[PDB]
Structure formats: structure tokens, C-alpha cells
Amino acid sequence: ALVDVFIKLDGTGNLLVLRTLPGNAHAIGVLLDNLDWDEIVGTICGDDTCLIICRTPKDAKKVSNQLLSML
Amino acid sequence: ALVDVFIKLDGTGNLLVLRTLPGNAHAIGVLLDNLDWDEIVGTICGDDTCLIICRTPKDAKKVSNQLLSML
Amino acid sequence: ALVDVFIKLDGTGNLLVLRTLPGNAHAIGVLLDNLDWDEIVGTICGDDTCLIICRTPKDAKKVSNQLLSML
Amino acid sequence: ALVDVFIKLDGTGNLLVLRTLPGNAHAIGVLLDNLDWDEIVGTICGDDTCLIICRTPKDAKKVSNQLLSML
Amino acid sequence: ALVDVFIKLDGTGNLLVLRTLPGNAHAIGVLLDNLDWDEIVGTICGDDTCLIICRTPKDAKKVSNQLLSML
């Protein structure tokens, strides 16, 4: 249901910062962790932000593309 | 929204305990706080549980019915 | 400190619901727990709401008074 | 592993307040939710406090006894 | 506000790690997110630590400077 709470997807190097509606970070964090993509080392969620730690910037770009493709 | 994460709605006296999918408590906590129902004194969310503190058991029954009606 | 984030103090029976600025519930929760008032059985904080569980409605009124006196 | 993080168990009416070591509330919240005791309506965890909402004070006393028996 | 809870500001590359008083991470996280500085890609808060993800190490030094200037 990413499109229902997704707000913005930014990034730097091997890191992606996914911004969601208030209080929905952990909901997508659950989604992300359940994908278990090899490119994602791990995810950490606060209240409206999800930090996706990827192996490399290239894996980040890849994850970013697959994520935006779900909207 | 609610129907997509709702799992169970229980209660005792003036208290309602809303159970949601893992990591979705704060998402509905935002929904509940946004409704600003006079019956709801306040809400506190953990990871998958939302505690809705109502003024009286009567107000709780009322809130429970309006909540279930959105399912 | 409290006056800097305090927004509203409500209650029912032996329960008090303290509303704070977004993300400041746990800051006050720390304050409350550090007071160790005999009247307060315990505190549970979400994002902007603090549930203060008091022993009796009378202890709740007492706690409410002391809290508002710090504003 | 309750005994490893348990600090104190208090209560009022149908409510129980379980105090744990810092950051361990959700760990026991998981334990409590997995028990699915009929007496427990629900649980809400903060950082070091777990609020156990029981149906009645009698169910609270019962839950309290079973919990302390695990230490 | 920041000076009231600020404890330490560290960093590595494009990342800044802001340490605050216990339970005050999200309070500052709200402050940071409200500044919407172009240098900050995003923020993630735990209990007493705020991770500020900046675009580059240079933007991190900049953000660090502006932050410490508010003390």
C-alpha cells in the first residue's frame, strides 16, 4: 500500500530516505523488511521517515527504481 | 484505511483497545487523533495496539460502533 | 520544561491524559517518572500523549493540580 | 525471560503497570500479547512501562499472580 | 529549545549523530524536519539519538555549524 502513504524518496550514496505520512514509517518498514531484497542491508524507521541502508550506491539506485515502480 | 490494518477492537469500561497489523498502530493513531471525536479523551499507540481513552463506557460503546462501521 | 511542550491536561477517574507538542511525549514521560510521586502508579507515552495512571480519582485530581501548578 | 528485565508490577482496578529495564517494555509486550490470556484485553508499551488492560480488577489480580509466578 | 536537550553532536562523512537527553530525540527530530534545510536529506530519531542524513560531508559540516550556532 506504499502509494497510500508514500510522500517522497530521496537518497545519498548507498542510503535512501523514504518519507511517509505521519506515523506510517513502521508500516512501510514492515513492507521493506518483508521484501528481503539483497540490495537492502537493513531498514530503520522513526515516525515518518524510513532509512534504507543499501550495500552500494548502485544497489541504492536499483532499490529506488523498484520502489518508485510500485507507485 | 482502517479496514486495511484493523485486526480487532476490544474494550473495558471507558477504554478501547484497537489491535492492528504489526507496525501500524501509529498510523491509525493519527487517524483517530484527526477525527477529534468528543468521546475520545486521547489515544496512545505502541507498535500494534492503540489505546483509546474515552470519557465513559457509554462514550466507548459509541466510539466502538462508529469505528466498526468504517469496516 | 513542561510549560514549553504542554498543550492540554485531561482526565477520567484515576487516569490523566497529558497532551504535548508532537514528539515530546517521552520527554515529559521522563520528567513524570523522575518525580516518583506516590499518586502515580505509572506512565505510558506515545508520540504526543502521556497516559498517567494514578491510584484513585482523588490522587489523579491531586496530580493534575501539581502538574498545572508548574505552568 | 521476564525475570531478566522485570523491575516491578503495580496496579489499580482492572489496570496493571509493569515496569521493566530501560528499553525493554516492548520485549515483554511481545511476551504478553503472545500469551493471549482471556483476562488481558490488551497491552500498550512505552519505553520501560507496559500497561496491561484487564477486563476487571479480579482478572487483574489473577494476571498479576500468574505474572509474578514466572519470576 | 535545542540547547535545553542538546548533549553532543558528532559525525562521519555525510552523517551527523545528534545525542539528546533521554526521550528527547523526536522533539529535536521535529525541529530538524521543520527547518527543511536543503543540506539535510532526512532525519531518523530513536530515543536519545537523531541521525541527520546530509547530502555530502560538506553539507554535513555546514549543518553541524548552523546547529552548534543555536547553542
Next chain:
Amino acid sequence: ALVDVFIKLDGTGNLLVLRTLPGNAHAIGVLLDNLDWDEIVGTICGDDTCLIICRTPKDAKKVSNQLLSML
């Protein structure tokens, strides 16, 4: 302690991602912060993931080895 909730330890560069049982991230976050290892700049915990920000990938390898040695 750690062995009782530890699930996986991954990493990239100066970052380590520790995965724990659901709801146990902050319990080990407390453990990590209590160690005050010079290698660890800081830690941020969500629900089941702990992000350990180390100064360099070398420090991360070091921290990773001492962590796994406690298993």
C-alpha cells in the same frame, strides 16, 4: 542477553545493521550505548533493527567482531 535476541548482523562501510527479535531493538540499543565503545559514534533503534554508526568501516569490522564474539 544479546544471544537471546540476536538474529543477524550485517553492514556496509562504517554502518552495522543489527537485527533482533521483534520489539527487542531498544533493549540491545541500551546495551550498546552502555558499552560506550570508542568505535561506535552512536546507535538508533527501531522495533527490530539497530543501526550502529561507526566512525570508519575498520571500526565497524572491529565492532562487528566483538559483537559476534558475545554470541
